[PDB]
């Protein structure tokens, strides 16, 4: 359940979301964010115009470091451009990197479907923990692409 932090949802722009579930993007950079447990399943919500859960991946490592060293070490796996990285971290010296593995694309679970699982679902700005029952219903709708 939620205290275990094994099931979470994050939101990504469509080109980055699709890059995670295809395995091209294996690092996700964040500022301050609740940290999941290791081996947590991270469901990928793709924002407008897709507005759907389109896959998931598993968290294999959490890195916390300084902005410039993380770009050097992990920027190529993170898919975004250097300008987009500097924009996002403008105003802090600290960065967090999620290292992901075992990406799995699924048939999109659209917004109305997610609203049956969670009445007031909104795309998380950072990360939202899934309740046991919420994870159950989500798994019940997972199908191959």
Q: Retrieve residue 15's tokens.
A: 């080109």
The total number of residues shown for the chain amounts to 145
Backbone phi, psi, residue 40, to 5°: -60, 145
Q: Retrieve residue 54's tokens.
A: 């389109």
Count other C-beta atoms under 10 Å from residue 141's C-beta: 16
Strands 41-46 and 7-12: parallel
Cis ω before 49 (30° cut-off from 0): yes
51 vs 54: CA distance, rounded Å? 9
For residue 54, the SS3 value is strand
Considering only CA atoms, give the Rg of the chain.
15
* Beta-strand runs (E) in the chain: 7-12, 27-30, 41-46, 52-66, 94-109, 128-129
């Amino acid at each position: 359940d939620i205290p275990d932090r094994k099931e979470a949802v994050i939101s990504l722009w469509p080109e980055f979301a699709k890059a995670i579930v295809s395995g091209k993007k294996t690092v996700e950079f964040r500022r301050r964010i609740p940290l999941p447990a290791l081996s947590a399943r991270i469901w990928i919500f793709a924002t407008r115009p897709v507005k759907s859960v389109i896959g998931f991946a598993y968290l294999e490592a959490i890195v916390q470091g300084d902005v410039n060293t993380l770009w050097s070490r992990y920027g190529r796996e993170a898919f975004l451009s250097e300008q987009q990285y500097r924009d996002y971290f403008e105003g802090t010296e600290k960065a967090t990197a999620f290292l992901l593995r075992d990406h799995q694309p699924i048939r999109p679970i659209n917004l109305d479907q997610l609203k049956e699982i969670r009445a007031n679902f909104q795309p998380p700005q950072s990360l939202t923990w899934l309740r046991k029952e919420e994870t159950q219903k989500l798994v019940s709708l997972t199908s191959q692409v």
